[model samples]
Target chain A: SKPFTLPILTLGELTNSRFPLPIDVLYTNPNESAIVQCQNGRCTLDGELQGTTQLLPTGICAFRGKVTQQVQDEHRGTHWNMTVTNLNGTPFDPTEDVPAPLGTPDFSGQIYGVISQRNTNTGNLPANRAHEAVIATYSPKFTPKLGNIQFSTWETQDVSSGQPTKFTPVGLASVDANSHFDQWTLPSYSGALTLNMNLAPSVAPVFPGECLLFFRSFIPLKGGYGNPAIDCLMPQEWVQHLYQESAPSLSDVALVRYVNPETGRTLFEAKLHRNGFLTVARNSAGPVVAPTNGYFRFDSWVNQFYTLAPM
Target chain B: SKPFTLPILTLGELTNSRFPLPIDVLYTNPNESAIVQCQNGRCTLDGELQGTTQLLPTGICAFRGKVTQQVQDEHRGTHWNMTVTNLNGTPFDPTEDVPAPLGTPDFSGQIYGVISQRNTNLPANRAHEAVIATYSPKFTPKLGNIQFSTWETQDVSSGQPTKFTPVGLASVDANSHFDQWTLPSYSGALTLNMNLAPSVAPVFPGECLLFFRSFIPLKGGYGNPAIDCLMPQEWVQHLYQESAPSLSDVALVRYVNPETGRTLFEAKLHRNGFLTVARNSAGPVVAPTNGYFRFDSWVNQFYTLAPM
Candidate 1:
């Protein structure tokens, strides 16, 4: 047997209220010896019966998400990707010109907790502070052999306060036109970014169309974040809610709010990284003094894209 | 191939608390292709070793024990044929004797805590109580078509107050015989009796003994008696240390008396069981009423004779 095959289709959608909505993909064969699989960044497999094998194979298969670049990493193991991003207002502030590619952060210290909060309050901003949006392509086949994989810039300097637009990469207008990857609202302004891929055939042989691209948005604390069970940032709902509500402005940027679910209270507020999409938020005392153009590789904010296939 | 065979032996011994200890039988054979098989009340064949197997076959040859009978019918599983008779130094009283085949007290609703304390003070005035024990026989030239086996006393009403000479029913003295078909100790006064036999042994092999026996002493609660963990008698020990240790005969019966407050503080049990054998103090109670005749069956109190 040429290794039983299952093709996975994508329904480009996004949801802000709740993550990991189920997205259905139709498999071609009914009774053939085949399985559907899903994973992130690299293909992953579920040993348990979360991935069901049917005596009769054909049906409407569902994956649980239409995740943003950040949502993919936060909700790492689920298959809820059904919702779409229909942000009525522009997704990014347009007045200030987009900056050049800022370099990745020096993740030297022990980093933990939610690093960033999404800025839903979009508008023109001061010259020193500009609300930047990041976009990246997600493919399940990409696994880093050495260090972390670097982020690519899809569009920068297009200062338009538009609803999340399909990413348009610079200098590829002629050849790569109409290659619009779906866009989503960021989880937080400073935390990790996840660009999930649709499930890949070669990687996940069981649930072929069910996989995702992941990016982590971690914040550095004076000490590492408390244990996951005790920490407030560990809850997916808290991080997601904060991402939808917190507003990161252009200048004199206020810190993003993190909520603790256990006590139903706000745990901490943090300063945002000025570059394209810095995954981690550093714990500095004073207001963020680093200018908008201070960091190199400013356009390296966007992380991975993941495709969560229904098991 | 021919079936393997080996030699086996039998031990003639009975277990007693004060003097006689239980005997253990052992068997040995070559390492391979040998098995020591036992059936009925004896070892039918101690199989042989072909010298091809690796591991040596050496361990406990054969041993035995008996189930205790309970004071009441409801105590089906909890009752085994094991019990403690007269405490040390107590004399057997022939007066106040309950008739034979007496039904044990119901003692159902009564919480054992209070009764144990009162009974501990009742006293066993030199009364003899039967305790449980077991035996096993070895065989040769495997006999066939055996029916049943149990320990039974053939002789009756003709022994010392301290002893009951019981021999196997099939022993040389057939006139002085008791069969396993008779019921165990029953009625009021001490009676030499026969009891239940385990049915269905195929061969009456040579060297095979008929049965092993266990005796249980019918006792009254008084004194600091120990209780078996899983039996009704467990209540006796529980009440002594926890509720009222001062009432125990060990305290009241002592020569150098300790204060009541001081004595209760030191009452800790050495062991926990349906019946406990202590080497230290006398039982908690002594009989106030006289002639409380302590009765038992014919094979009830036999001292050990010799080893097999």
Candidate 2:
């Protein structure tokens, strides 16, 4: 596999004299009620939150208030945007602080769509729909540059195809303990890629023996995993104990705030999520057939993604 | 200042069933009380209260009982004897048990007294007098020919003429620290001679500092003061403070008693006095001219014996 590198953003160095950086707005979850950790260096900027994809430095930061909407940013590259309602009752003052990671550029790549599916493991289990995507790039620094992605789908379906399905990016789901995504970097190819048409949730702490899936993202015709003959699918034993033990559910999303390590100010916010691909079968008795489309890949192997919740 | 060897007794080795040995006894002062301790084994003799001496093997036969009568042993030597009465409850039982070192005739030696007279230092302070005149032969096993002699005083008076006092020559003061008193072998001009003197009481806890006297006894000095010196003697500064600190007032005094090791059936007792000598000047403002007599000839300094 070819490997690639991701750009490092030192969020502590950005200086905004007109619209000061609102670092305090960064908190633990997407909704306003989650724990708001104090600011520190190296923050992710959600341009949609305050309307900009500007540069910032990297250091400790002081978080102020709640985070609002969850948006995506694809102009410079593939990233999420946060909509912060207010900075702890205060607006983003232009006079006080600067964004972190002063002059770093956003990641440059593309996200392709794949499928929406769930798992068939138990009789009482709910099935999930998801997708897969990739990002190609020239930077060797971003090894495994390919981004295999997926999202959640409920009653809403693809309007054009009249299918009951919705696609929420893989960045929203929690990281599954059982399923681990692979990042490969091939020196000869000078490229990096991530794969798993499979989808799974972040491994829950209570459930000891279970497999989790993120979203369904498949291998391209060129990238390895292109054999149409062998039916590269999973078995019932894969996600057998996916929810073996009940785990504490997340109430809000978690984010990292950025600030100046030396001066101590507000910079930006970064939210994390573990991807869940497909839902499994309901009961233990099963021919264990695939319900939706192809094999239901899950996050059951290893730590797939960091998690994220609604509020 | 002539040196003489005393009789040495070996209590270590003795297979004989009847071990008839002489024991020394001391009489306490009238209207006063003293603590008596023994060395060898425990005390089986009856007297006052019974207790154990801390210096084991060197048992301490201390009793806080009052002194009744003061007797002097004239036949054997010029030794002072005091009879004590009113034993609270514990009776004297000699057959109890003594320490190993003081048990037999084979392990005898000159047992140094734990308490010494005021001759050393600290005028007012009295040492729990040490027995100096008793002789133990096997103390130093290598020199079996020589007798280990413990030092003592000739008489309790200054070298002057006085009425002689008479007391009984009983066995070793069973209540007194016990150790075999063996007779020395050498009988030449360099023969063994013994001096029986009073040992000062070592300072004890809760005891007040006072003055006492020191004197040398002259031949024919019975027990009267007319024969003793009444003149000035060297004085010793605070002495008790210079020796052992807090002394245990009561020690093992019963035979085979845990306090005093002794396995015999008979009981033993001990009595000795530490006179509280004081200075009484005639003038209102002038310092006192005289105090207790001093033993400067032996200790090179002066000291005072006082009340407990």
Candidate 3:
């Protein structure tokens, strides 16, 4: 079946965003299997898609996803590709950008986030001073492998100032953590990034999508790795089954915006691998720097998390 | 082929234990497929039995067991029925008790362990005076379901005190935290239980069998609520692998004590749905006590993956 694509942000909304996003930070995995499978028209994850699920040995089960979104386009300017509505009546944009050959996304968008003294000691930047975009992405360029999801301090760089915005690679371009379903905005020049501790979606984990509605499962894994959950990311609507686990899957709760007494930088207990899971307010210190073994194992800066898997 | 049984311990050993066991402690799943498959030979955990394995979602996997042992005897007295050694050339006693009519094993062996205030608040017993056995078995009745592997506090009871010892269900009979690599022992008069925490083994998630290792993989729909990861109960000297995990066929690992914690017996799960355990150089640890084997953890240490 032809793998379908959905637009995360409307082409216009994306193109018309405040700043021109850069390619340096955008990334993706070419090896990921499409979460949603499409055939005739309305691309719904019903029938086998939602019914057929996988269970992990650790007593955790997974309902595979069938949704994939388009992040880049070269021939014609990038646009939403959602060509059908799911069985749930949700529409999705078709994705285009082949990985048959090594191609780079037409880096075009700006990211926002806070500055910090991340002592990762991997990049070239001034010490004592850190100006990382609030929207640093660990999105790896498409590859057979999903590449490393770094959980360490990003390498140093000036700022995404006027010209030449330098970004550490990984996240999807222009996609800041939606954070919550409520109408929320980022603080000044803070790269308008996300430290989404999105515990509640104003009663939803169901976030708005560009071409379609996208969803999140749990926290990205800690310790220099991206959340594998995202690799097989679930949709806004999914049904999981049996003996559900407590620590590693669809599990995270609590609303704590711990302040780094020293840096006075406001931070939340967000996923280390995924930077924009929550909004790390300026003059903020790095998150309490806690990493867990799997994605979603570490707590996020959310008010509290509810089980997507209603067993 | 007719189903067979092996001896978990010498028939005389179990029959001649310190105290007479009871039906209150013994339970088996009626629906669970025999972990061991023996058609026509010396029962060894070779080939399909050890190679084929199942992986769990929480990143844990399970290697099914092919060596089923006999626990009861209605005819010629219960005893060893291994009838064969695995491909690794290890001896195994055969199994006999069947789950045809949801029958229970004639609970005849003693389980030992220390007692404490479990406070589950489910059964009857002296409140402050807890006398649980060193081993507690959760072996559920064979009805196509594996009961819960409780991690909470056990209910109170006047444990295996010769006459009437009430116990909580969840673990297998006569098992305890066979905790370490070296020779070890548990406290006395204890209801031996498990509390494992295995963190070493990890695997890439699979699309099926995340819940039912026995369930045939399907797209996504109604799943059998009878799904569960059965815990390991027996001990062996050495272990072997039929093969390593591949893109198509893969390997799985399960702690014999999945009902307890992560640590315990390191088993090589096979694709054909079975698991085989390992032992630490067939040296000293031979006797099976109070009924648990968190299980000789170091035994599986010698299990090397097969290349062929």
Candidate 4:
């Protein structure tokens, strides 16, 4: 187990780009999105204590709890905050600097935190309601570098020999709630990428929850996948719910929070996906919380939010 | 004017994300991507002198230069730099701490600048071709908080409208290039705001522009159409002088007056009502990335033929 490096979480100066402290957060459903909420070293949910806030092995310092949700009360979610150590093991004061430390990074930047509402700050002192504060970080695992969009990010089996071949991504196959796409074509940045990379399409004057979303690169996966290509399925939900639209991603620049559609109350909750990797078994009845590929980068752990437009 | 923050040159905390000092460079074209290579304080383009370095109104304490190029040496293109300035009109020692009263934005979190290649580190007297570092406070003027493509930050009209209206944009219609797209509906965030925004057609692969615009009536002196139908620069003349719906595979989307809900003349949402749009405009920079659009196929078969 690696001792966590403050301000310098993982040692990837180039790949991590802006997010030196990018904590990966995988997203599931409302009920499973967040299991707990922590503040001032206290974690809770439903007005009850949930888990302990302490340092864990995966370089994660957080609270662990079973998640629960009522549509309106969802955003009061599990959040995290970090601090530095003095020569002694006590936490460093905000006024205190990381004296003479050439080894670790400085906490000058508030690298990670939760966001409650749109256009509000995400440094997290805890808000009335807390939605996950996030900006999409490029999960180089499932996706490729933005510059290399013409190529596919996943490696497919060579059919017979099963050798990995970097194939071109086929067109977008739009899936409706019924799980079928009436329209299919070779995808383009202008169409598929733009649509998937955006904050959902506004085809009519309504929200896009019921809209046809673009899923499936049509390229075969190295491991495997299924094509029940409809809304509510694992892959479908990942593209629409978990993955960020293009503007918010390509590289983490800003953060946002999903708002309560009815009350419009957004709690700047920072969601950190529960740490173990778990995908659904084939012909299984459980939720496919994890992908066939263990996880998307470090994202399954810490969350990034979009607070500009109400999701 | 705010005294140039000593340890840092410019003053911006939040908006100016990373670069403590950013220098804006408008990109047209060239002999190279990274030119005007600088080692330390020394700057050179394809190995020629461009201009001397210093602090200006923008407060960048770096060399000022107009760039040039040679045939096969574009990567050696004129890149730029900056320095900390003294209150008494001089260079601040990079070693000294930033003087007191320096505030507003921090050079941390986000400081932007340009790049030539990939990893051109700054401290080692080498510039790691930055992501899109125009560190000047004025780096964002006309449109605020604009995002760059995966690489090159070129000026394309495909911007997400600040105000979400049914419009698209390109460069200001100084009537330059082909005329602005006249009448059309937008697809995604590339939907432009009406500051006379331009459409981001194909990158024109070295020069295959999709020009031509749609127009709007009602609110203009002589002529000022509300929209512009973007066409491959080649198709402009076709719409400019269409031949009586010559191609039969054409349909139109009707715009109506919300007040009376009256129909406002219909035109092909797809340019020239050409059923097959060979290319889709992903704003300006991105061209030919993916393939075709799917929904267009559904309506394209039997045209909701415009009012003949």
For each candidate, the alpha-carbon lDDT, in order, equals 0.17, 0.19, 0.20, 0.19
Estimate, for each residue in A60-113, the C-alpha lDDT of model 1 and write its tens digit.
011111223422333112111112121111122222121101111111111111
TM-scores, all models, native as reference:
0.13, 0.13, 0.18, 0.18
lDDT of 4 at A120: 17
Error of 1 at B125 (Å): 99
Candidate 4 lDDT over residue span B1-308, tens digit each: 11110011111100011111111110112222222211111111111111111111011211111112211214532222222123222333423322110111111111122211111121111111121122233222112221211122231112111110001111122331212112111111343312111222222122222212122111001222222112211112112222223222333333233345454333333322221222222222221211111211223433443331
| Candidate 2 Cα errors over 4 Å, as ranges | A1-138, A141-205, A223-288, A293-311, B1-308
**Which scores greater on lDDT, model 1 or model 4?**
4
Q: Model 4, A218-311: lDDT tens per residue?
A: 1111111222111111121111112111111222211223233345444322222122111210222222232211222222122223222222
Which ten-residue region of model 2 chain A has the weakest summed lDDT? A227-236
Docking class of 3: incorrect
Candidate 1 Cα outliers beyond 4 Å, as residue runs: A1-19, A24-38, A41-145, A152-311, B1-308
> How large is the interface RMSD of each prediction?
42.9, 54.3, 30.0, 25.1
Model 3 chain A poorest 10 in a row by lDDT: A56-65
At residue A10, give the lDDT of candidate 1.
12
Report the Cα lDDT for candidate 3: 0.20
Better of 1 and 4 by TM-score: 4
Candidate 2 structure quality by residue, lDDT tens digits, A139-213: 332221121111212223321121222111111011122112221111111133433111111222122221221
